[PDB]
């Protein structure tokens, strides 16, 4: 029921203003932390900016600190993005998410296109590691990595999401090892603390499976999403 649906995307020239917007539902909208994640075409997740229930907390990413103003309308249930000084790199498709708590993504929206015009941006304080593509075959299991640089793992929860080629990233797997509700059993989430890594398991295959996967925690400043791991069915 949950619903966030994605506004405002359009074509833009540099230097030029533009605000995205998005409606949410089927939640109290105050009573949570709004973000807004980024992705150019054939590119991983992005970070971009970060927002608490009351408003009070607002986190931006390193690309876009001061160009971009994040902030919402809690009377209107409106979460919307202000954008400055549209450069070239910021073409990609902004998605609306819900955060359960800071840097724990659990709903996620449609998405809205926005292109700046008159190679992918890289990915990964601290940085993620993943493969950059495993594969197997049907009904056999595989492990994804994810290991974390700098800061402790366990301090921060962990998160999956699979994203298929032209859908919406879902999650899979919140708080390390927690499963949304209607996420498959086989999808299971473990930590190894002394590796600082985060694995993601998928018992007995499908080929459905095949879609991207990306990880991602969080520390107290800003959200990181890992580069993503092509997971090939054969």
């Known amino acids: 029921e949950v619903q966030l649906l994605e506004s405002g995307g359009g074509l833009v020239q540099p230097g030029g203003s533009l605000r995205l917007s998005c409606a949410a539902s089927?939640?109290?909208?105050?009573?949570?932390?709004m973000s807004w994640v980024r992705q150019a075409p054939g590119c991983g997740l992005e970070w971009v900016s970060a927002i608490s229930g009351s408003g009070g907390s607002t986190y931006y990413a390193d690309s876009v600190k001061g160009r971009f103003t994040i902030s919402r309308d809690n009377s209107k249930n409106t979460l919307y993005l202000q954008m400055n000084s549209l450069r070239a790199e910021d073409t990609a498709v902004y998605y609306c998410?819900?955060?359960?708590?800071?840097?724990?993504?659990?709903?996620w929206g449609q998405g809205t296109l926005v292109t700046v015009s008159s190679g992918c941006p890289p990915c990964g304080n601290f940085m993620l590691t993943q493969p950059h593509s495993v594969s197997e075959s049907p009904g056999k299991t595989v492990t994804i990595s994810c290991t974390r640089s700098?800061?402790?793992?366990?301090?921060?929860?962990v998160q999956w999401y699979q994203q298929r080629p032209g859908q919406s990233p879902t999650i899979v797997i919140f708080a390390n090892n927690q499963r949304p509700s209607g996420v498959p059993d086989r999808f299971s989430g473990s930590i190894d603390s002394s590796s600082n890594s985060a694995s993601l398991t998928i018992s007995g295959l499908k080929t459905e499976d095949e879609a991207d996967y990306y990880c991602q925690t969080y520390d107290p400043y800003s959200v990181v999403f890992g580069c993503g791991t092509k997971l090939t069915v054969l």
């Open positions: 998410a819900r955060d359960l708590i800071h840097g724990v993504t659990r709903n």
């Open positions: 089927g939640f109290g909208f105050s009573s949570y932390a």
């Open positions: 700098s800061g402790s793992l366990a301090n921060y929860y």
